[PDB]
Amino acid sequence: GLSDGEWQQVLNVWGKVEADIAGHGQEVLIRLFTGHPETLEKFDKFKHLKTEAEMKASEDLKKHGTVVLTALGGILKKKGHHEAELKPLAQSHATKHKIPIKYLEFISDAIIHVLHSKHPGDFGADAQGAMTKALELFRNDIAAKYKELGFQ
Ligand code: HEM
């Protein structure tokens, strides 16, 4: 449950991401994969990436980063009214990709890390609070769908 002012902060922060969705998406995934190498194993199409240099050079990783952040941005712009947008992602990530909710926590924190890394001094405490709450809401609603599906 975010206030109007918190959603305003979220969407203000998101404008930073939308200016360079592929660069943000790439860095989010690289942060996820390098911080939590087990997550790489969930991607048949990225498990060949042995080094961060290879990850950085991967155009397909940037492409997927764009897909991920485009989806997330579409969800965030719903300001919590995202059941229709979230449902297929929860279902695909539980049933097809088999992504534990822990990895969604990892990527949520990776987003925060990337925002500070790319916008140092420009991702204020209020913005971090609002973005964190929005990612918690996202993760929590996914978690509810995971529970429905019995997925761990
Ligand atoms: C912000 C959180 C995430 C968003 C918005 C997101 C979004 C997406 C989207 C839109 C797709 C393609 C459509 C689909 O298959 O449903 C996808 C595919 C996929 N996602 Fe995610 N995802 C997120 C987090 C994760 C995490 C944390 C993992 C694993 C650690 C993961 C693993 C995968 C895999 C393996 C695929 C299939 C990739 C392929 O083979 O093309 N996702 N994701």
Author numbering: 1 to 152
Text of the article:
Photodissociation of carboxymyoglobin (MbCO) is a well-characterized model reaction that has implications in a wide range of fields, ranging from organometallic chemistry to protein dynamics. Here we describe ultrafast pump–probe SFX experiments on the photodissociation of carboxymyoglobin, showing that different pump laser fluences yield markedly different results. The hallmarks of MbCO photolysis are the observation of an unbound CO accompanied by changes in the iron’s spin states and position. Upon CO photodissociation, sequential changes of the Fe spin state occur, ultimately yielding the high spin state, and resulting in a movement of the iron-out-of-(haem)-plane (FeOOP) as well as motions of surrounding protein moieties.
We performed a multitime point pump–probe TR-SFX experiment on MbCO at SwissFEL to follow the CO photodissociation process at high temporal and spatial resolution to obtain insight into the reaction mechanism. To check whether the dynamics of the system are affected by the pump laser fluence, we used four different pump laser fluences (2.4, approx. 5, 23 and 101 mJ cm−2, resulting in nominally approx. 0.3 to 12 absorbed photons/haem at the front of a crystal facing the pump laser beam, see Supplementary Table 2). To increase the relative yield of photoproduct at low laser fluence, we used smaller crystals for the 2.4 and approx. 5 mJ cm−2 data series. Of note, at 5 and 23 mJ cm−2 the apparent increase of CO* occupancy occurs with time constants of approximately 350 and 450 fs, respectively, and are reminiscent of the damping constant of a coherent nuclear oscillation of CO* that was predicted by recent computational wavepacket analysis. Since the time resolution of our experiment does not allow the predicted 1 Å amplitude, approximately 42 fs period oscillations to be resolved, they would manifest themselves simply as disorder due to distribution of the electron density over a large volume, resulting in an apparently low occupancy. As the oscillation damps, the CO* position ‘narrows’ and its apparent occupancy converges to the value observed for the respective laser fluences at approximately 10 ps. Moreover, a strong oscillatory modulation with a frequency of about 300 fs of the His93 displacement and to a lesser extent of the neighbouring residues is clearly visible for the 5 mJ cm−2 data only. Recent quantum dynamics computations have linked the microscopic origins of ligand photolysis and spin crossover reactions in photoexcited MbCO to nuclear vibrations and predicted coherent oscillations of the Fe–CO bond distance. This prediction is consistent with our TR-SFX data showing an apparent increase of the CO* occupancy within 0.5 ps after low fluence photoexitation of MbCO, which mirrors the damping of the oscillation.
